[PDB]
A paper describes a structure:
Here we determine and characterize cryo-electron microscopy structures of the [name] homotetramer, fully occupied with [name]γ3 auxiliary subunits ([name]/γ3). Desensitized [name]/γ3 substantially deviates from this behaviour and, despite the limited NTD and LBD resolution of this highly dynamic state, we could trace major transitions throughout the receptor. Second, the NTD dimers translate into a parallel configuration, where some classes adopt an ‘O-shape’ conformation, as described for heteromeric GluA2/3 and GluA2/4 NTDs. The B/D LBDs undergo up to 90° rotation along an axis perpendicular to the M1 gating linkers, with the M3 and M4 linkers accommodating this motion.
These cation channels assemble in various combinations from four core subunits, [name]–4, with each contributing unique gating kinetics, trafficking and subsynaptic localization. AMPARs exhibit a modular architecture with a two-layer extracellular region connected to the transmembrane ion channel (transmembrane domain, TMD). The ion channel is encircled by diverse auxiliary subunits, modulating receptor gating kinetics, pharmacology and ion flux, with the transmembrane AMPAR regulatory proteins (TARPs γ2, γ3, γ4, γ5, γ7, γ8) being the most abundant.
Residue numbers in the entry:
A (entry chain F): 5 to 41, 55 to 84, 92 to 94, 96 to 162, 172 to 209
B (entry chain B): 746 to 767, 781 to 815
C (entry chain A): 409 to 503, 508 to 547, 566 to 622, 627 to 697
D (entry chain D): 566 to 622, 629 to 649
Amino acid sequence: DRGIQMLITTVGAFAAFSLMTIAVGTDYWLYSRGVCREEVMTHSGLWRTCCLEGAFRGVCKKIDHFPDTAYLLRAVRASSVFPILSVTLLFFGGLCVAASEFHRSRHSVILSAGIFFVSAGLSNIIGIIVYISANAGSYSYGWSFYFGAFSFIIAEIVGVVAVHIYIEKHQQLRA
Amino acid sequence: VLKLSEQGVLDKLKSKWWYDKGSALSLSNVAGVFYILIGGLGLAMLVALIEFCYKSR
Amino acid sequence: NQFEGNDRYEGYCVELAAEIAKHVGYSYRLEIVSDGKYGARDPDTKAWNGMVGELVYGRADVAVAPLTITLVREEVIDFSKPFMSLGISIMIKKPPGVFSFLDPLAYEIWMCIVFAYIGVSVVLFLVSRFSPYEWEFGIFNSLWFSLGAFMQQGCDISPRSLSGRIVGGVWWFFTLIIISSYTANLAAFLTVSPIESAEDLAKQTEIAYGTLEAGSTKEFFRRSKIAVFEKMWTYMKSAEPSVFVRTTEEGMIRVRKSKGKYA
Amino acid sequence: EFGIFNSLWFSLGAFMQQGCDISPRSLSGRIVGGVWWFFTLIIISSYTANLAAFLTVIESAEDLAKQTEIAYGTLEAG
């Protein structure tokens, strides 16, 4: 399964990175009643909110994250550093998988991707917990929110595979 | 005042100047353990790399 | 439709009017009151409306409806001995799920639990497999241990390395808070009632309570001097929207369609 | 060594939160163990939560009027 493990890892890295970049980019994260300027049904994401019904349909405005130290929750969400931190490690992880077949002499290159993909997922769940807690303090999530949750699973499975590849690479080196 | 009251003027003035102005547990209160958890793995992952580098050298 | 006149109607008062007419020896035509109101003296116009108005102004000679005997009415019309007893009473709407066991923890908490279960098991696999000092904690075994330690059931393997034991330590603490909170929240859910309770202080609550307009009950509440009834009247007169109704059927449907929010 | 008797012993131990000297290894065996553990967690939590509600908290005249096992009388010449 050495060839298929190579083929599975590259697309999983590309898919997980592609799944978050649209998830952060799009604004279909939440469905709740609000005002995009009288309040109508709205769809809001990480940065902007736009009403999907009414006279102001399609009109988008920046989300006011700043309308008591434990302020940090608003600041972390206002900067949204964790969701973009998750994308950066996924971008970094892909490069380490990309350079895995070029510098075959070093076995630590493929481990760097494995730990990065696991680390990307850990920022994924933290970004999700911050987002859920910040918005709480009826509602529904669009496909953008589930893009992040599915990106977390794909990145973690690739992280397991990459480390699984490393242990076999060093096992055959010992033998 | 009696004429203004009987002609509805006082009521209209009042309406204009006063009325026309106008159990499931959540993630919010259990977010601490998740915060402590992810801090546990981040520290545990760092400890593995520190001990792995120390063991190698 | 097959019948017309006094013969078009039925009911207790119809037969009572028939029997009274038989005993008194007179012919009669059952005229339904036009206003559809029982009777009241409008405090502004001082005009009697409904059946009492029909009787006083001469348009009718008898009233055989469920007309309550009241002091104000006895001052303007004559009443016979009562033919039925009654009192003011409260009418309230008499009115689990297969997956209800997930209620104590919201739908958000479960998603993060399965994310944490996947997150920690992978981390436990990584910190215990990449170490050349060690190499039983593969991906499958790690999933079994973390899943096993979730529901307090133990496992055939325990972490030995420092990295593995820290991961197990926080999850062992993590599962303690979640399991204890779920049981504690379920106990609150299973722990948390009619009576002039909501009619003790009265409604007290969104359980708005109304009366029929131009009825003896409204007049009874208006002219009451009992503390509870005065409190109820002050609430009913000022409450918006109007708690009062125009007909008994209207109040009945209001309670049936307020789903236990209207008394 | 999960024989019929051992499975009965393991399931009784697993259901009652006491653990066991043997645990399933195969994927098929572990799926059964996982769902049983999840089931026993809900029932045990349900039992304690409902007992706490019971310990923290005829009952009518109609009840007394409907029945006839409890005799009811009046005053004579009243």
